[PDB]
Structures are given as C-alpha cells and as structure tokens.
Amino acid sequence: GREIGLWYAKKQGQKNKEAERQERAVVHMDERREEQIVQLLHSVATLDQQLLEDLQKKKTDLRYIEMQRFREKLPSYGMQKELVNMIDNHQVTVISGETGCGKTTQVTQFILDNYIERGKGSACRIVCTQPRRISAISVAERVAAERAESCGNGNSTGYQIRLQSRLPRKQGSILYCTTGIILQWLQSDPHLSSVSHIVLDEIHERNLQSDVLMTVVKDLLSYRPDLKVVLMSATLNAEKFSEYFGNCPMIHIPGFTFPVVEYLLEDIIEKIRYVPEQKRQEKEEKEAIYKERWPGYLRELRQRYSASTVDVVEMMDDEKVDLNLIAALIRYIVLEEEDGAILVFLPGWDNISTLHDLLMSQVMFKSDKFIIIPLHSLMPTVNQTQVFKRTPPGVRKIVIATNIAETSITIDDVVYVIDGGKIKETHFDTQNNISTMSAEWVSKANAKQRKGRAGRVQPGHCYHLYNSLRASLLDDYQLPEILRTPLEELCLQIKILRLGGIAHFLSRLMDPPSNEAVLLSIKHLMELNALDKQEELTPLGVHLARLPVEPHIGKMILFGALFCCLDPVLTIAASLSFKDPFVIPLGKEKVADARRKELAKDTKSDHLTVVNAFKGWEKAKQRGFRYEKDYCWEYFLSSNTLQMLHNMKGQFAEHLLGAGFVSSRNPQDPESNINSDNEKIIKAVICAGLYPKVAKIRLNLGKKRKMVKVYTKTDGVVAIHPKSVNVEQTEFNYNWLIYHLKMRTSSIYLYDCTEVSPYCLLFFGGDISIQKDNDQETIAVDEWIIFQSPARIAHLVKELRKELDILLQEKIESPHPVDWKDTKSRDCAVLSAIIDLIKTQEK
C-alpha cells in the first residue's frame, strides 16, 4: 500500500542528507591570525488692519475678478454662508460631497477670507493634509493662482512635502502638507500649538498615517478647546466618521458632473452581439448568497433578454477578466460611437500586455489614427506627457491602465470608460507571517471612483463587466490598510510620540487591528532588541524610531555608519525604502533584464546593482547634460527616482550628523568612507541589517539540467523572482542568501537576494553554538546554519563575537565618530581584517 511510498521517501531523504552533509563551507582563518586573535583576547496689531487693506486693494484687481468669475460657478460657493457659520459654532464638523465640487480648494479659502474680513485675520493658520505629494503640489499651486499670487515667497499660501517646501507667511496663510509632515511635527510640540484650523482631506481612503493622525487629533482635542478640526469625506459611509467623533454635524455639498450611463455585462452582450470563442471566511459567506440566488436570477433574466445573451452570461468565467470581450467592445465603440478617448482598467501587467498584443494583432489597430498608451508604475515616466496632450480629431486615443489612472492621472479628456471589475490587493497573513497578493472584486467605492472619471467636460459612457447580481453583492468598502500591513514602524511611532501604552492606543483606533498582529509585532520588536523587556524603548530603539525608515533598514544605516562605509550603504537603504531606478518598457523586457545583469557585473548580488547604477549615473552627470540622458536611456534607468534617492541620501547623512555618528552632513566625506571600495564589507553590513531573513540554497548536481532549490527556516520552499539578478545563476561561491521582500502571489517569491560569506553570518547573526555531528566541531549560529571548523577556531570565533557584541552595545548607546589611528578597542579592526581577507571558501 502506502509503505512503498514511505520506503522511497526514506531512501531519497537519506541520500539527500548524506549529500548535504558533505557540502558545508569550511571555516578556518590562518596560523598567524590565530596568534593575533589570542593576543588581542588576552589583552581584551497693525497687521490685522494691513490684511484687510490688502484684501480691499486686491478686490479691484482684474485677474482677481476674472478668477471670481469662474469660482462663482462652483457648487460649494452656494453653501458659503453655511459652511463657515457651523465651523464657527461647532468644534468638529464633517463635510461630505460627491465628485465635482471643489471643496478642497474652497473650504479653506472660505475660513481664511471670513477671518480676514472679520478683522481678526492674524489669529488663524490653516493646515490642510493631502494624501499625495503631486496632489498637494497641484492644489497649492492652483489656490495660489486663484488669489492672483504665487505659492510661497511670503504669500498667503504654500505647501510642504518631503525635501520640497515653499512656506507661506506665518500669520494667516494656508499650508498644504502630507500626513507625514504633521506626524513628524507632533514630536517637537505634542499639543500642535500655533495651528488654528486643522483640515484632514480624502480621509475615506483609510490609509495608515491618516488613521493615526485622526486618533491623535481626537484624543488631543481635550487639551485644546480652541482648536478646530474639519474632515472632508466623500459620501457613501460618511456617517461612520460622524458617529466615531461624537455625532458631529454634517454638511452634504451637492456635486456637479455631466450625466453618464452605466452598462452592465448583460447590456453590453446584448448591444454588441458578442459570441464567445470556442474553447477567506467572509468571502465564503457572500459567495454562498451569490450561489443561492444564482438560478432564480437567471429564471428572471430569460424573460428580459434573448436566449443567446443568457447563454453567454451563464457560461461566464468568474476568476479572470476575458480580454476578448474588451477587444470586441473597443471594436464596436470605434466603429459605431462618436469621437472620444477610451480608458480601460485592468488588474495588472499580465492582462495589460495580453490586451495590448491582442489589439495590435488586428489589422485596423495599426494605422496612424489609433494610438495605444499603456499606463503602469514600471513604465518610463508614466509614458511622458503623451496622455495629457490634446488629441487631434480622428485618432481615438486608447489608454490601458491599472489603478494608477483612477487616483492621480487626470487625463480630463476620456468619455468612454471600460471597467473590468477586478483589482489587486496586498493582504497580510499573521499565522504564516507572510504578506500575500491576490485579485479581488472591486468595491462600490472603487466602482464609483472609476465611473466618475468619464463625465467631466462632456457626457460619456461607463461599461462595467459584471452582472447585476455581482453588482448588488459588492463590498461596501475595501479593507482599511490598518488591518493589512505589518505594524512594526507604527509600533515605534506610538512610543516615540509618547501617545500611550503601545497596545492601549491601538484599541482606540477606528477598526482596531487584531490582537494577534499586535502581539506578533511586539514580539518581533523585542527579538530585534529595539524594545525593552517592558516596552521602554531601549537606546537603539530611539535611533530606530527617529529615522524615517523601517527598523531593519535603520539598523543597516547605523551599522554602515559605524564601519565607515556610509555611501553605498546609504544608497542601498534609500533604494530599499522607495522603489528602484529601473523601469521596464512594455515592448522590451528581455533587453532590460539582459542589460541589468551587465550592471550587476560579478557581485552575484541584487542590492549592489543599485550601487553600480548610481555610481555610473553620478560619473555620467559630470560629463554633461546630454550624456546623462544617454546613460539613462541605455540602461533603462529613471532620472527622477535617482534624484529622489540622492535627496534621501542627503537627508540620512544630515540626521546621522545630528545624532553624532559622523562628522559632516556630506554623505561622501573621505574620513567616513575608508571601507567603501570593498564589496565584502558592504555585504557584511547588509547581512548585519537584514539578519533574520536568511535562505539556504542547494544545487542539485546532475539531474539533467542543474537547478538550485531555495529553502527557508519557516516558509517551506521559496523561489527566486524572475526579476532578480540571481534568477538564472547556477554558480554560487557560498550557499547562503539574504533577502528583504518576500511575497506570496502564487508561490513564495524573493524579490531581491544577495549571497553572504560565512563570516558575515557568524558575527552578525544568532547565538553561536558548538557541536560535533560525527564530522568535525561544526559551528552553528542558529542550530540550522551549520559550518565546518575545528574547535580551537570556533572557540576563538565565539569569544570574538561576544566581545564585538559588548563593544557594539557600548558604541551604539553613546555614539562617537571613532578614530582608526589609535589602539583602544581594536575588535572592529580585527573583524574587518578577517572579513576583508581570508574567506574565499568557494564552497
């Protein structure tokens, strides 16, 4: 029976274990190095009236009158008498309005104008929070233009985002900022003084930072009775915020859009006459209802439509969008309907590429007229400003886009919208401690957001791709981001702001996270040694929290600063927290992967390719402006991302100087870059940063094609993502890898992986233990990472590791620049000598 399978399994496992035993890297330093280490171990106001006069003088400006001429047409002006008045009376108000009414650029101006005209115009300072950088810039610029002025330069409006700030004047004025700016402001002055009107906008998205800021405002309102907070949701479940804040008054601002008509799947199939080509938990409960009502619904539909439509709708796939239907719908729209610009929404790249190929396959979609512009976050400069250009008559511009286009693209020309009802979400599995990524049906808010892009300047049409039963059973809203994502950086943010009791505060959030996730995050932080035994923010924790990155990246930055390899480590840290400078165009994907491996050279690493690309870009910038563009074109780089990385490096160096680890704000000073030309030291520092993420690789010698299998301690058998450099590699000097991002899309995937030497794991690793498994005095760092070495060397390695740990604790607790020209604590020098030299195991 099943005994033969067990016999096969045992016979294979014995051989596999016997083959893996004789493939462990040997650890041995030298004859003289042992003597040196032994020796070292043995040695161990008129302004108020001025504002009114300026307003009166500007009231006669021709440009100001012209701006008022358009501003009068906005619906929100009709509520100006009310919107201000209640804001004057109540403390917290909720403003709900549909798309079309410019509440963002009107509500703030109403309060400012009322305060200025009333006389007490020097006692207000409105701070409005936006969820996107480009949105904040555009809103601030437009508001500045609306008052016949310019943003910043001491005017009455301005904005502030990361590394870009045009500040307005202190008294009066408006400041548009992202949520992170306010959350960082909360550290200096906890009560947020000198702010008279805090405005939270687009709060219905329910992102991570807005929820925290809203809770802080709610529990801060007790100590600041004179502070006014104004929330702007957008219809639908706008009563939830009012109930949460204590039944505050609400105002419903009417919208204004051109009429649009919605067609569902049955209407589309009936209209275009399309014949098909010949061939958890809660998610279950809804589906059950969709099953129970499935037959009866059809039993009605057969009387409202033809037989063929019912047959096509019944035999319909519910797990993937069919691109043949979209390709036929676009054909029908092109041939019959009038001029416009089709905009189709797709889940991801796998469908965008297929739809583009299907469209370009047909003969008519190849002439001068039709142009197809895919939109994605991994395409060059979102295909430039081609989408924003006005289409000459007789072209029928077609855009195939993921969700990028439903939030901030603003083509402002489309009239036909096609909505394949599928979106991609990134959940987080607490039991398996791995974040997943799946495709789920769009929510009602998502459907409304996609439909609202059609009618803005001209009446249009919206074509949804699901039947009425699925439309009626759609989720009201997407899951709040507070209930997905690890809560690790947030946990340190709670303690650095002294908000409360790390776990007590998280219970006051709207839709509080599950207790298991909080406990897991606290345990992970305790293991990382950032948090004390009783959650007291150990000295490493303060530096980790004050840095604007994840704790793992923060430790890498600190260790790179300690070991005098600041520049490449800072570049890697900057590129590990904000994208990467590589963009893959739609047509050419093999070429990009072939020219990225050339950048990788022979480092057998993924993080080192970013360093090489940045070094090449910096060397090319000095030559000239045209050379920079040529270099970015040849290697498929992005200039904007590289500039942002440069600014982030500057900010990190400034903070490190502020703490005291380094002696200059410049991240390329020659004093703190001694070990900057060695890749081994950089790899050791990276392994010190991202230690717990270590994967073993096994090369199955023979068996037709030589293949490498990657294993992890907990997550079974992972596989290297094809985008990584080491996807096709088969010759590894060391059989160990470290990674940063690991995701479960369909199978567990590592997105960036780099090999590490045994000495990089022995020192910056777990608890070293010495054993004897009938082979030698094998030394293990975590009981599963085993190396071969004699006992006399393993004992020295363990003692040196203990001394290094003590020295690093002392150095991190009290930072110092450290001088390499003296002999006070030379553990670091000996460790650098060991890592730089020796090694070369090639096993």
Add this chain to the structure above:
DNA sequence: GGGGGGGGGGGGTTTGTTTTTT
C-alpha cells in the same frame, strides 16, 4: 510531474499604489 483525474489548488517562472521637521 504530466496532461492519472477534475484528492487540492502542493507545484506549474513574473509585475496593484503610496507615504516621513527643526
């Protein structure tokens, strides 16, 4: 692994967007 059979979705190369003082 392959195309036994449609046990289970354990595997079968890929790729929602977005954020941080002085």
Add this chain to the structure above:
DNA sequence: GGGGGGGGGTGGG
C-alpha cells in the same frame, strides 16, 4: 490524496 507512477520525498501519509 491513494496506492496513477515511481515526478519528489523540503508535498503529504
């Protein structure tokens, strides 16, 4: 999963 086939056995019994 059983007990197709001996595809792997770090997929499970």
